[PDB]
Amino acid sequence: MKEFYLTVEQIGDSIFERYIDSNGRERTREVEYKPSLFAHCPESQATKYFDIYGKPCTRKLFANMRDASQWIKRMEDIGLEALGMDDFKLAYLSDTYNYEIKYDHTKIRVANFDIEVTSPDGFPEPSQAKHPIDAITHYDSIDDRFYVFDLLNSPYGNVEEWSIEIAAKLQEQGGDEVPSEIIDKIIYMPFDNEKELLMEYLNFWQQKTPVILTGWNVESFAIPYVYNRIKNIFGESTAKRLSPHRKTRVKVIENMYGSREIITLFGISVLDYIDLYKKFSFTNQPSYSLDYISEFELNVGKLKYDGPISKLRESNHQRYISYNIIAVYRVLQIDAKRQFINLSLDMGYYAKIQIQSVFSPIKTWDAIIFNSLKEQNKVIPQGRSHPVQPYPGAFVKEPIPNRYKYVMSFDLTSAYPSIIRQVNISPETIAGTFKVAPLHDYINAVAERPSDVYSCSPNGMMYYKDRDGVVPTEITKVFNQRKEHKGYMLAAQRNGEIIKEALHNPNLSVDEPLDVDYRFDFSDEIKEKIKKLSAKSLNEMLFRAQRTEVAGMTAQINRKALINGLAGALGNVWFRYYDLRNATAITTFGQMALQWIERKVNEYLNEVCGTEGEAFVLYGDTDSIYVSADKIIDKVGESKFRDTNHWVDFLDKFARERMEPAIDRGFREMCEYMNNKQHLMFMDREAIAGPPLGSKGIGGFWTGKKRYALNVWDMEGTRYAEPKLKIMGLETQKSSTPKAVQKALKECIRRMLQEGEESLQEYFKEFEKEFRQLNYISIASVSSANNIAKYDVGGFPGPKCPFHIRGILTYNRAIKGNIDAPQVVEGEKVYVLPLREGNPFGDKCIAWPSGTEITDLIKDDVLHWMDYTVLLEKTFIKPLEGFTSAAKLDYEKKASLFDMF
DNA sequence: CAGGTAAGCAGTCCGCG
DNA sequence: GCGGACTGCTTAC
Numbered sequence: 029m030k031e032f033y034l035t036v037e038q039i040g041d042s043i044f045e046r047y048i049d050s051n052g053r054e055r056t057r058e059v060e061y062k063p064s065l066f067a068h069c070p071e072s073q074a075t076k077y078f079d080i081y082g083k084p085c086t087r088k089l090f091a092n093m094r095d096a097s098q099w100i101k102r103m104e105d106i107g108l109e110a111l112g113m114d115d116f117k118l119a120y121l122s123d124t125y126n127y128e129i130k131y132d133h134t135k136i137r138v139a140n141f142d143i144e145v146t147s148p149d150g151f152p153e154p155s156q157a158k159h160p161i162d163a164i165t166h167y168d169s170i171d172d173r174f175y176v177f178d179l180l181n182s183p184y185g186n187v188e189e190w191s192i193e194i195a196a197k198l199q200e201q202g203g204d205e206v207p208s209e210i211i212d213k214i215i216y217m218p219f220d221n222e223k224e225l226l227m228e229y230l231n232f233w234q235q236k237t238p239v240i241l242t243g244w245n246v247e248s249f250a251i252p253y254v255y256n257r258i259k260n261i262f263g264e265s266t267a268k269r270l271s272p273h274r275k276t277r278v279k280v281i282e283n284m285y286g287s288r289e290i291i292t293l294f295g296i297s298v299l300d301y302i303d304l305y306k307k308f309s310f311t312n313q314p315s316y317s318l319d320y321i322s323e324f325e326l327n328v329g330k331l332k333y334d335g336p337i338s339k340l341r342e343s344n345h346q347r348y349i350s351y352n353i354i355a356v357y358r359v360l361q362i363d364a365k366r367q368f369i370n371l372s373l374d375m376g377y378y379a380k381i382q383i384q385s386v387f388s389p390i391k392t393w394d395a396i397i398f399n400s401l402k403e404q405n406k407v408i409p410q411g412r413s414h415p416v417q418p419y420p421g422a423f424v425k426e427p428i429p430n431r432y433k434y435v436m437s438f439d440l441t442s443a444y445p446s447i448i449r450q451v452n453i454s455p456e457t458i459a460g461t462f463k464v465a466p467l468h469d470y471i472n473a474v475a476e477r478p479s480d481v482y483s484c485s486p487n488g489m490m491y492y493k494d495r496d497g498v499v500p501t502e503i504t505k506v507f508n509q510r511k512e513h514k515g516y517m518l519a520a521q522r523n524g525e526i527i528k529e530a531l532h533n534p535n536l537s538v539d540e541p542l543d544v545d546y547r548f549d550f551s552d553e554i555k556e557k558i559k560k561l562s563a564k565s566l567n568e569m570l571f572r573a574q575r576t577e578v579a580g581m582t583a584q585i586n587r588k589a590l591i592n593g594l595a596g597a598l599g600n601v602w603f604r605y606y607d608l609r610n611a612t613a614i615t616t617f618g619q620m621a622l623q624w625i626e627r628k629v630n631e632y633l634n635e636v637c638g639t640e641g642e643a644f645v646l647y648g649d650t651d652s653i654y655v656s657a658d659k660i661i662d663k664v665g666e667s668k669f670r671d672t673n674h675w676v677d678f679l680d681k682f683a684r685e686r687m688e689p690a691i692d693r694g695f696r697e698m699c700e701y702m703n704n705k706q707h708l709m710f711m712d713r714e715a716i717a718g719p720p721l722g723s724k725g726i727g728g729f730w731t732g733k734k735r736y737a738l739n740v741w742d743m744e745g746t747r748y749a750e751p752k753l754k755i756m757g758l759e760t761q762k763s764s765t766p767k768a769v770q771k772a773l774k775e776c777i778r779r780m781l782q783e784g785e786e787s788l789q790e791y792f793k794e795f796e797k798e799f800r801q802l803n804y805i806s807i808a809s810v811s812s813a814n815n816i817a818k819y820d821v822g823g824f825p826g827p828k829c830p831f832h833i834r835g836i837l838t839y840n841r842a843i844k845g846n847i848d849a850p851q852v853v854e855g856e857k858v859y860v861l862p863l864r865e866g867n868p869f870g871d872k873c874i875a876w877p878s879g880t881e882i883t884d885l886i887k888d889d890v891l892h893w894m895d896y897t898v899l900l901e902k903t904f905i906k907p908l909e910g911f912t913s914a915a916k917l918d919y920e921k922k923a924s925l926f927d928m929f
Numbered sequence: 930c931a932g933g934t935a936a937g938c939a940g941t942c943c944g945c946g
Numbered sequence: 947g948c949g950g951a952c953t954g955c956t957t958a959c
């Protein structure tokens with residue numbers, strides 16, 4: 029097999045590299061890598077190296093990396109550009125792996141671990157590490173085993189061994205329900221003292237040294253805690269054994285409000301799963317506890333126990349250890365679903381970066397562009413310092429708030445990357461500028477044609493047309509990967525809908541799920557077999573279809589995120605290729621494109637409807653248009669349709685056969701107007717939306733920009749078994765909205781869109797009457813909590829104290845002088861409840877850490893004093909009043925003449 | 930900690946005769 | 947009481 033790196037580090041004048049050799053074995057080597065950098069040279073000096081602008085460069089070979097670094101400094105002192113990859117390990121990888129890397133994940137040691145630490149005096153601070161580590165579960169992907177290190181004797185209690193047999197038993201048998209599929213994979217090691225546990229852990233670590241190290245909060249808790257605890261007991265040199273090169277450093281992570289410390293382990297790639305999840309999942313959760321996320325992702329019940337965690341070990345060590353093992357497994361189950369590790373490996377190896385650099389699109393693109401340019405003996409420019417400057421973004425159309433019955437949407441495929449490719453936007457393709465007319469002049473095609481030579485954006489920028497820039501070239505490659513994966517995602521989705529239809533008529537049989545590839549549209553033979561299957565087999569197939577869809581979604585959406593990130597990287601001052609002219613070329617072209625095509629679509633539809641000045645495009649945001657199809661439906665007449673699906677077909681066909689060609693023609697003209705390099709503005713139908721045929725549903729409504737809801741029947745070629753609500757911006761979509769309120773508002777909207785005003789009124793009246801019975805957590809608002817200390821004036825709200833911060837200050841007073849009560853963590857999320865006047869907490873709200881029950885000390889008082897009236901008014905009635913006035917109906921029945929009977 | 934901008938709503942403070 | 951200036955938070959794209 030071809031060799032591939034595992035990790036790479038620079039340590040002084042050495043590159044330290046762990047890799048897989050040609051025989052599939054893991055090796056390590058120290059290389060005295062001599063880097064090259066570059067300086068401009070005279071034209072009369074023959075060379076093969078040119079900067080991106082075609083200027084000749086001489087290559088400078090240094091005796092060592094420190095010499096190269098010093099030269100860079102002196103070049104700054106002189107005032108001359110020092111060209112080339114200043115991050116020598118990326119140059120090392122580029123030299124050592126000069127080919128498309130083909131990696132084998134089965135050879136990469138992926139470690140997933142979690143630690144337990146009993147603490148009687150509050151949260152165990154990793155930088156202090158003053159409490160014993162009393163459990164470690166460490167799963168190794170190569171052995172496929174969970175290694176359990178269990179401390180039996182501690183100053184906080186001596187316990188009996190954990191029993192695998194009890195762990196396996198059902199909760200109803202007194203057991204812990206550790207999943208049977210992992211029972212045989214547990215290797216259990218009890219220890220009579222902490223020193224021996226830790227020494228054995230380090231010996232194990234030496235044998236099975238993680239390449240990728242993950243787990244939940246490992247970078248902020250487990251890793252610094254283990255490191256610091258070993259450091260406290262044995263000294264620094266022993267703690268550094270966590271690094272295969274015996275090198276670590278404390279890294280200080282700074283944000284706007286403060287800073288925190290992590291431990292960089294040289295020769296390890298830490299991918300904390302919480303951070304993977306936040307970057308790649310495209311969720312925003314009310315809580316990020318593993319219990320909360322596990323429940324969300326896997327629908328597994330919360331790990332139940334009595335008393336505080338600080339007493340769990342001594343009260344029930346059996347459960348304590350089982351829960352540590354289950355916690356490690358949960359992360360593996362989440363990754364089995366979401367495939368974020370797989371994604372990280374793919375993207376890292378593609379770019380030729382340390383795997384942990386996938387978190388940084390700037391680093392990712394710097395490396396991709398460097399490798400691409402190097403292939404042609406081109407030399408990258410030095411990074412420079414830039415002041416942060418604002419610049420313009422997208423256009424958003426102001427919609428008229430209203431109900432909208434029939435709606436068809438269209439948007440650009442991969443909008444910003446397509447603009448980059450079409451216009452040819454790149455650092456080295458800038459050809460010059462032209463005199464700009466007001467945007468509306470280009471939108472209305474009255475402005476002078478910008479250029480007859482170069483490819484243009486309406487911000488005034490011109491680009492060469494003779495060759496592709498490195499940015500278009502490289503963005504195209506990742507776009508193509510994205511498209512492939514989206515294909516699989518959509519096929520899995522469509523396949524899922526076939527199974528849901530079939531589930532309306534399950535056969536009374538004992539049979540098996542079909543062995544099929546869900547990434548490809550079911551053949552007719554598969555469809556026939558499915559129509560004969562039992563519910564059990566069909567549900568298992570649906571589960572598999574949906575897992576395939578999730579897998580496809582991860583692959584596609586994060587590749588989209590990467591290419592979109594290049595468009596923004598051009599507008600980040602730390603990017604080597606930062607240029608506001610290019611960042612603005614993209615966004616301004618986007619503004620023009622949307623408003624251009626809005627005009628073209630209106631003109632086209634006014635023409636086919638025999639009207640003038642009518643607005644068919646009701647809304648648009650960035651790269652999308654929403655078209656009212658009422659008149660199209662009305663031209664055939666609602667009476668002519670057999671069922672809902674009939675008019676959906678008709679609109680689908682109308683969009684595909686009439687609208688899309690018209691849209692394409694309009695964009696080709698725009699491309700020609702801008703003299704662009706390649707027509708790549710492809711605006712395909714997204715949604716077909718309307719009420720169910722013969723119902724009183726309103727179909728859809730807008731309240732304002734970025735706030736709307738649609739009853740969708742077909743999304744990007746997926747025809748749903750059941751209509752699906754596309755809701756954007758409204759309170760149902762906000763993590764700040766109470767969970768039960770999100771649910772109720774969603775049901776109000778469903779009724780509005782599908783059934784009508786009377787159905788909405790029936791549900792409101794019931795919700796208003798019954799909501800007081802809702803569990804307090806389900807009706808609590810949620811907010812991130814920043815700057816708690818800034819607004820704290822002697823434990824009371826300072827001036828301008830935000831509402832959620834006030835709640836926290838209230839909480840802090842109520843738990844005063846408790847090491848045991850859970851503290852609110854600066855920067856994390858809290859639940860927030862309003863309090864009735866005259867309450868014992870002495871303020872109008874209380875907040876406590878999100879994802880948790882409020883401490884028993886105050887729980888009963890909170891329940892007693894909760895202000896249900898304020899809560900309902902603010903989270904439910906106010907937003908619902910917004911939805912219904914926009915939609916022009918009433919959530920409460922108004923009086924009529926009939927009442928007199 | 931980790932590409933970008935546009936823009937919504939909650940809440941504070943305070944004016945508005 | 948609602949709006950504007952402002953802070954804070956959150957989402958759409």
Ligand SMILES: Cc1cn([C@H]2C[C@H](O)[C@@H](COP(=O)(O)OP(=O)(O)OP(=O)(O)O)O2)c(=O)[nH]c1=O
Nearest residue numbers: 439440441442443444445588592650651933959
């Ligand atoms: C979703 C999203 C969009 N955008 C910008 C860049 C996008 O190209 C543009 C339009 O967004 P989208 O229409 O959401 O995405 P897209 O056009 O890139 O891809 P698709 O083919 O799935 O439609 O808005 C971001 O900058 N960040 C984001 O997270």
Ligand SMILES: [Ca+2]
Nearest residue numbers: 143144352355
């Ligand atoms: Ca724990």
Ligand SMILES: [Ca+2]
Nearest residue numbers: 439440441442
């Ligand atoms: Ca799009």
Ligand SMILES: [Ca+2]
Nearest residue numbers: 439441712744
């Ligand atoms: Ca599309």
Ligand SMILES: [Ca+2]
Nearest residue numbers: 533535559560
């Ligand atoms: Ca059947």
Ligand SMILES: [Ca+2]
Nearest residue numbers: 439440651652
């Ligand atoms: Ca869009």
